Amino acid sequence: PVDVSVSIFINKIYGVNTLEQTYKVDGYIVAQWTGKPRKTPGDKPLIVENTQIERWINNGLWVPALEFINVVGSPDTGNKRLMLFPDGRVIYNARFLGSFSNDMDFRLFPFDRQQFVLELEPFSYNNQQLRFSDIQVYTENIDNEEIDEWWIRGKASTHISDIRYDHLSSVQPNQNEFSRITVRIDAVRNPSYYLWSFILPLGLIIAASWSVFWLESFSERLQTSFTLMLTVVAYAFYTSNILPRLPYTTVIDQMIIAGYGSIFAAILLIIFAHHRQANGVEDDLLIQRCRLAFPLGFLAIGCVLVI
Amino acid sequence: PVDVSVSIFINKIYGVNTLEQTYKVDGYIVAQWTGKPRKTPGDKPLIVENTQIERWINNGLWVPALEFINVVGSPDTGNKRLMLFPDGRVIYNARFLGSFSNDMDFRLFPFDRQQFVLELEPFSYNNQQLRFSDIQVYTENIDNEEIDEWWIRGKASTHISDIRYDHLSSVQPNQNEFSRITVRIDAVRNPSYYLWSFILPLGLIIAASWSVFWLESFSERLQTSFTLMLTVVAYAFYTSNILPRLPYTTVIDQMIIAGYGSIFAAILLIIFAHHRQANGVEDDLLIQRCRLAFPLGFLAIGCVLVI
Amino acid sequence: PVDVSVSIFINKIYGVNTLEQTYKVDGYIVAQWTGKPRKTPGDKPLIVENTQIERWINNGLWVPALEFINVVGSPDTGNKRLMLFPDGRVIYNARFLGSFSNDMDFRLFPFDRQQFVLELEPFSYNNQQLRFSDIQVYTENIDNEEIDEWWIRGKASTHISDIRYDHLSSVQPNQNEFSRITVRIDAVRNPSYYLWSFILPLGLIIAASWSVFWLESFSERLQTSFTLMLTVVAYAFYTSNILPRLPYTTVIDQMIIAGYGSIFAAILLIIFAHHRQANGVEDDLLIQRCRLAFPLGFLAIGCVLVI
Amino acid sequence: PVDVSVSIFINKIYGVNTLEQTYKVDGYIVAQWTGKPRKTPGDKPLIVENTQIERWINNGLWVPALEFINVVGSPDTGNKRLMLFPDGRVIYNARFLGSFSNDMDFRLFPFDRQQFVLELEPFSYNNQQLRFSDIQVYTENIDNEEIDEWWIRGKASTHISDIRYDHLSSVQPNQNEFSRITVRIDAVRNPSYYLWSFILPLGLIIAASWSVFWLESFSERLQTSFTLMLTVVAYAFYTSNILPRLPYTTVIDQMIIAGYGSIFAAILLIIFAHHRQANGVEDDLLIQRCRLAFPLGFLAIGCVLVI
Amino acid sequence: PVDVSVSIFINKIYGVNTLEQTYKVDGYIVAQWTGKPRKTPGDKPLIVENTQIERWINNGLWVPALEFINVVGSPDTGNKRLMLFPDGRVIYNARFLGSFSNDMDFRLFPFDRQQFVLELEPFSYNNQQLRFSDIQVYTENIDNEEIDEWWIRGKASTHISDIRYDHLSSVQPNQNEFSRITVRIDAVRNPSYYLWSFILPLGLIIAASWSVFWLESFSERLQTSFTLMLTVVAYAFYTSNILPRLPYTTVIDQMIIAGYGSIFAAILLIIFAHHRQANGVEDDLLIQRCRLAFPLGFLAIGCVLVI
Numbered sequence A, B, C, D, E: 001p002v003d004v005s006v007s008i009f010i011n012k013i014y015g016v017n018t019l020e021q022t023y024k025v026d027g028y029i030v031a032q033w034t035g036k037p038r039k040t041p042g043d044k045p046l047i048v049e050n051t052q053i054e055r056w057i058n059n060g061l062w063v064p065a066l067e068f069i070n071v072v073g074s075p076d077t078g079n080k081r082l083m084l085f086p087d088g089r090v091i092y093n094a095r096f097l098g099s100f101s102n103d104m105d106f107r108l109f110p111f112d113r114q115q116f117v118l119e120l121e122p123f124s125y126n127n128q129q130l131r132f133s134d135i136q137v138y139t140e141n142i143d144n145e146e147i148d149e150w151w152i153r154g155k156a157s158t159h160i161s162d163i164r165y166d167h168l169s170s171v172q173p174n175q176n177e178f179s180r181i182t183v184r185i186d187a188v189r190n191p192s193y194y195l196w197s198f199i200l201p202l203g204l205i206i207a208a209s210w211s212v213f214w215l216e217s218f219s220e221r222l223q224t225s226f227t228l229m230l231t232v233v234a235y236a237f238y239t240s241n242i243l244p245r246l247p248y249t250t251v252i253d254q255m256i257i258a259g260y261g262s263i264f265a266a267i268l269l270i271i272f273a274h275h276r277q278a279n280g281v282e283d284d285l286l287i288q289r290c291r292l293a294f295p296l297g298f299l300a301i302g303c304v305l306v307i
């Protein structure tokens, strides 16, 4: 088996798409193996560029096709090259921009914690013909500053395993294990924008909703509650335009439904305080002691729901 | 006729587009047939990569072109390879990302139930020259968890038939049947997001609409009803931005029109209760017993409309 | 001149873009002509695939380039093939996905009636070297059901004409007529969604606008009219987001302006009924008999504008 | 120097992008020059198609590369051909779809007046080796009707000049002038949609804003003014979604700010009329004679700002 | 080492994408080095076009591959050419359209100040085989007028350095320094649109918010404050649709939160002025002297926050 040493340079990770669960990684890949000795011009190593590589492969040079398992489509390969040494050492360096995929969980949306996975595997050669020796990952370009949307936490985590394919038992007996490289990069979201523009004014709106029981009349309370309901609907749409599409409810979504429930509970208490009459003229004040109890009860419900 | 055995691996199904009725499938395809015996280097099977295949076809190798019937455009073929055995067995493995199409019914939108169809057919050879032996479909990567937008229900369903083309009777008599493979994958939508963010607050708004007959005056009722109408219009737009474009009304759309009808019926009852006067000063209370009857009548109408 | 017989199969028509006046057609094209006799392997006809065709053209095979006149850009040609008969008959079958263009009129938007045109012409050969014999169009896949956005009315309409180009008189005297094939497919829009979600609640809002003259006071009337004006602006935006961009006003647009005019006329009548005072205290009731006349006058104006 | 005669056929101009200042032109280009005499099959001129041209250039045929100077990227070249005459006359016809760029001024947005420029230049040959003889432009397909978004005013305007490049003085002395063709097409926007849907209801809203001084009380005036402010904000967003993104304020934008200023001036006059009290109880009517003066003053300010 | 002289012509810089931190540069690149003398046809220099260059490289011509380090993907190379002199001087001219990337800071959004960076480096040759002699940058096409979105301040700034790669110490000892060219272009945003459409009406809305303490009653104050809160939410959404997506709060965002805080502080002062009662009937005027103090305090807070 040929021992291939891979090195992956990550230049930038961006373009996270929550609906399709993809992201875009840009960088280089450097594979290195040892073949037969050869005589190059002089003694210095020989360099083959982008179109010239196909000319050398047609003449019988062995260059394996390394596949990204979780890429969507095909990577946009830029420049690529081969460096052939007279010793017999071959180095294949290429640049990619792919759209990779993973199992991404956005259920805690502003306070999220994802990891970005690249999986690499030979397209055709099992580990009796090509096994990966070692893998170094250089993520020195991606940073941790407040400008960046995602905080990359620590260096990348690497792994080399042997994936077994059970459909090859009919045609390739005893040789169906393929050598796979996995690269994981942990990342934490920047929650500052979503905490200052979305979480806080919704809390202010919900807190200002509770001050309709200071109104003296009853029709004033209902008209004010319906104005607050329109405010909560407008805020729900204001958040739901500027946020990533998801098939489940995030934290912000949980708070919008809490706002709707607060408005409807306020309307129900106003009606029940109005309806407590002997025949239609007897006023009420005992139920309206919830100017300091209903906000606390709703806050306790929310604190239970957070835990 | 040459017997070709196909195997389709489905990696992910995503990107469902309701207006154009498309979806995107990513995966592999493995065709396998038996030709003439040959002498390879050694006795081990020979492998041909991506660009090298065109070199072997020019020298006379028979590789059929398998077409996806319902693909839109042309698939984005990534890596592809041929494995040639000295026995005479040929295996063609290729990776695709296509945008397929089907007859999709979204008339029950959140509680939907679709099926994803892939149809495969030789581009040029009828079943007197190429017929499909058997087909295995491996959908082991696509899952059922709550993160996933679509719940894939059970294994895929396969079929091999003979499609007859009547336009070939002029030039190819008695040979116009083509062998076609059909693959169906049933899927159910994740209705949790649409049931918590769209169905429930609309029900709360419509339920809170009925509490305008507790208001004492008449001008208060009209101003409150118009505020509720603006709330329903804002909610209609809030849903209709965040939802898939369709040429027909879904469930959520049916509920928005029910909300408009509830507002207009409330306005009509307020006017008819106001207008019941002898000359302009006689008040009314008999018609305003619909504080507990009109909500029940509207709920009965909605329950009839669901069934 | 060589007689070429074309057959066009339409698979689906979709993706209508109103601003750029384009649409997307997917399907096949089958051209068939007769050349010189040849000796094929055996007596059976020979098949040439996608890349192999370029090899046969370099050796001197005559394959004309058929151009779509109204395509925008270049079609995304998928698989293509040549079938060469020993008789001398040649059949060229290819698959396309193009973005075609036409002169489209959306001035009656929900109740629209368009036709989709494909124009085909040889790129280089005038009718003294290549004329189109006959053309069959098979639109059997596109349907009429309620799921489909567009109702295709009847079979396609075909035509073969001779287009004359006057700029070729300087370099090609007496030979400047080119043979052109035109294919027209009539289609009617699905108006159900736009009639239930856009036309009807706007009518309900405009009808509920007229019930502000039942209010007793004057400040109540002005505040209520301004609330209705905000409702009409919100509805105008709700429609104008979910509709195709156009450089002219459609029916729905005509109704939005009718709603604005109804609100402004209501405000003008409220002011003129208020202003009819001797010095500032004399009330009015004679002008306020338009609770049953102004709606009828506006409906008559709208009925005149429809006709 | 070789004299090349160009003819440009414009098929359609569409897809104007205001932010990037681009537009899309589709059409043909026909260059024609005279070379060496040759012997073709027979005496009739010979035709070379799309892929065959590269075969003739490798054998030594001189085909210059004509570049569009202001194209963004590279044009989507469709079919192309060469017609070789035995006289020695060569005609190169090709079809393009490019995304061209210009210095576009949208500061008078609905009543705009732009011109579309195509600049053509040889990529490599200066005017001592290739100079453009004459240029005809055929814009017969683009029209003036009310369906069209842009009204093309008159025939195209053409020009042939000699552009001098000062960076070539180091390596190519006395030969750095290149022959450039410029084509200008004047166009006027269709202002009907923007005048009926955007200019007029904003004028109605601003005119209805002035009728808050007919209200008797003071709190009614403030609540009504704030409702009008919300109406103007909603209208500002309704226009600003459905309009082209620009880095400066257009006419419609000028009118939105005029509406905001009218609302704020109305609020200031209501406050100043309220505040004119001896101690807090003295009413006012002298300042409230601006029910017929403040609208006229604002209209005079707007008429000054238009001029 | 071969001395290569680069010249970069910038045609336009556009398409700035704030989320992915990219921009698009269009222009030319002219590299020039000196090789071996050769015999061309005649004595005039020879020109090689777009497809012909690959033919000359296969025969052994040395053309280095110059890479853009910060490009995303691969540039859309249009026309390219080689000019070969009999002296031995080689000139490689090519046209690119790339999507470059940089570390962009939009934290002061309308009053921004960015710089656009292009980095150029040989793909394979270290500075013992290829070092960059000098670099001229011609930005004569990009301007400073008010039509342009970005004001380019002064000429471009150039630099030539030696980047050292530490991963090459294992296979290429003592030769791992690569010659890199950096080009920086400073640019200032056009703040006029954002200052007239976004900053000023928000200031008018916030200033008009302070005039709710002129209202006499208490329920009027609360209803008016909630109407103002809905106005601020609608304005927040109106700005946040028409602005670039960012992971942090800009100036406009800071002002929206200031508006929310002003509304909530106004509500708190109205409640605290209402609540100052002995048992529920004692009115208040001492706290309501903040009709001229609370606006000044909020303005002082904002002026502190600006500094």
Ligand SMILES: CCCCCCCC/C=C/CCCCCCCC(=O)O[C@H](COC(=O)CCCCCCCCCCCCCCC)COP(=O)([O-])OCC[N+](C)(C)C
Pocket (backbone or CB within 6 Å): A249, A253, A254, A255, A257, A258, A259, A260, A261, A262, A264, A265, A268, A269, A272, A273, A276, A294, A297, A298, A301, A305, B196
């Ligand atoms: C026997 C004594 C009983 C106690 C009564 C004492 C009264 C004190 C009551 C005080 C009510 C306190 C208000 C807090 C309600 C918040 C609800 C909430 O956030 O959940 C929201 C829905 O909430 C709703 O649907 C609204 C329904 C609220 C009904 C309560 C009104 C009670 C008045 C009756 C008084 C009648 C008086 C009688 C006079 C005749 C959802 O929360 P979420 O987690 O954000 O959603 C995410 C869900 N996923 C996505 C995770 C799946």
Ligand SMILES: CCCCCCCC/C=C/CCCCCCCC(=O)O[C@H](COC(=O)CCCCCCCCCCCCCCC)COP(=O)([O-])OCC[N+](C)(C)C
Pocket (backbone or CB within 6 Å): B249, B253, B254, B255, B257, B258, B259, B260, B261, B262, B264, B265, B268, B269, B272, B273, B294, B297, B298, B301, B305, C196
């Ligand atoms: C002889 C006795 C008669 C009984 C009267 C007794 C009163 C009790 C009345 C009570 C009214 C009950 C309110 C429920 C109305 C819901 C309607 C609804 O959802 O359908 C919606 C439209 O609805 C509308 O268009 C609004 C019109 C409503 C008119 C009713 C007012 C009656 C008042 C008169 C009282 C006058 C008093 C006289 C005083 C002088 C559409 O439903 P959808 O399915 O969601 O749409 C989908 C359609 N597709 C897409 C499937 C195609």
Ligand SMILES: CCCCCCCC/C=C/CCCCCCCC(=O)O[C@H](COC(=O)CCCCCCCCCCCCCCC)COP(=O)([O-])OCC[N+](C)(C)C
Pocket (backbone or CB within 6 Å): C249, C253, C254, C255, C257, C258, C259, C260, C261, C262, C264, C265, C268, C269, C272, C273, C294, C297, C298, C301, C305, D196
């Ligand atoms: C001498 C007797 C005169 C009769 C008066 C009797 C009163 C009865 C009056 C009754 C008024 C009836 C209301 C109907 C108005 C609808 C207008 C409409 O839709 O056209 C819309 C604009 O409409 C507007 O611009 C609004 C202006 C309306 C002005 C009328 C108020 C009259 C009050 C004065 C009373 C003063 C009382 C005096 C007290 C002192 C546009 O329609 P469209 O087709 O949808 O637009 C598409 C256009 N394209 C795209 C096709 C180009």
Ligand SMILES: CCCCCCCC/C=C/CCCCCCCC(=O)O[C@H](COC(=O)CCCCCCCCCCCCCCC)COP(=O)([O-])OCC[N+](C)(C)C
Pocket (backbone or CB within 6 Å): D249, D253, D254, D255, D257, D258, D259, D260, D261, D262, D264, D265, D268, D269, D272, D273, D276, D287, D294, D297, D298, D301, D305, E196
């Ligand atoms: C000594 C006598 C003085 C005369 C007072 C007589 C009163 C009569 C007053 C009558 C006021 C008339 C209202 C018309 C205002 C329109 C403003 C406008 O459109 O410009 C807009 C901004 O406008 C604003 O910013 C709003 C500020 C308006 C302030 C006026 C209130 C005066 C009340 C004080 C009375 C106090 C009474 C005292 C009681 C104690 C911008 O216009 P634009 O062109 O669309 O913007 C585009 C700009 N670019 C893009 C081109 C760059």
Ligand SMILES: CCCCCCCC/C=C/CCCCCCCC(=O)O[C@H](COC(=O)CCCCCCCCCCCCCCC)COP(=O)([O-])OCC[N+](C)(C)C
Pocket (backbone or CB within 6 Å): A196, E249, E253, E254, E255, E257, E258, E259, E260, E261, E262, E264, E265, E268, E269, E272, E273, E276, E294, E297, E298, E301, E305
């Ligand atoms: C001991 C004496 C104490 C003094 C009281 C004297 C009263 C005078 C008070 C006057 C209040 C003055 C109003 C100005 C408030 C502006 C706040 C602001 O913009 O910051 C905003 C949040 O603001 C808020 O969250 C709203 C909270 C405001 C609370 C103040 C009400 C005090 C009433 C109590 C009176 C009770 C009376 C007692 C009767 C019983 C955020 O600002 P930003 O920079 O835009 O955000 C960007 C942040 N990043 C992105 C940079 C990170």
